[PDB]
Symmetry: C5
Subunit: 69 residues, 5 copies
């Protein structure tokens, strides 16, 4: 899967349908993997750099691969 965006988590959002949204770089992407929620919040809180890998690299895109640096 190709890299989509890399950077710090600007904000996260829990959604009504139980998905989780993250804002990295200039993209707002969401995921439906439950384990990623607390992991992504930890990344946000501790200010790590993350790379999101996805084919749907656009606002509203979904993803399920993340690299925590």
């Amino acid at each position: 899967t190709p890299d989509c965006v890399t950077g710090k988590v600007e904000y996260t959002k829990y959604n009504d349908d139980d998905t989780f949204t993250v804002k990295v770089g200039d993209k707002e992407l969401f995921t439906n993997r439950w384990n990623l929620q607390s992991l992504l919040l930890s990344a946000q809180i501790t200010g790590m750099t993350v790379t999101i890998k996805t084919n749907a690299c656009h606002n509203g895109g979904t993803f399920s691969e993340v690299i925590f640096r």
Copy 2:
């Protein structure tokens, strides 16, 4: 869903029916999504600013959408 309140979590409460209550701004709101409990406590401990989005924007109101900034 519209913004209801934005600010720091003053306090949280675990309820007998397992729902979770949060006090942000001047509203006391609750949620029945189990994943939000630890996330909201982290938000509280680390002092993040959160925005709660809900139609039931009033004390005793319920919610399931949150933005962590």
Copy 3:
């Protein structure tokens, strides 16, 4: 449910039977709600003030309502 004790978490104990015990004020109380284990440990580690609400307000008493400040 009435207030029972308020204060910092003196210590916590994971029990053989999988219940969780907390020492706040002069009472030692236990709960069987899982989600409360990690939440209570976080409260302990970060030095939060908690209020436990329960009718069984006595050593060995059970509880399932907690307020985290």
Copy 4:
């Protein structure tokens, strides 16, 4: 259950069979309760003092009761 060892967590080990091993004092003890893994790691990371209670108070001994302070 009697006290076995008290002190800081010197190290923890995740084992191939999903049990968790902890080194406190001069004993190396393991547990099969899944909830205790993250709790014990938090204890280790934050440098808490823990007391492990068990009858198998010897290297290779098992346990399921822990006091966190």
Copy 5:
């Protein structure tokens, strides 16, 4: 099980099939044990030194034993 690599966690990666990848030393290894994900991220965030024990000691290798110091 023999030691494979020891060092801090360079980065971690959540994979689409819900396995978790970690980069320690010069090896990139992955695990399918769900409990290790948050534990490894904590290790990464807090900069602990970990030792991964495995027979598949090579890039792409799996593992399920970890020592956190």
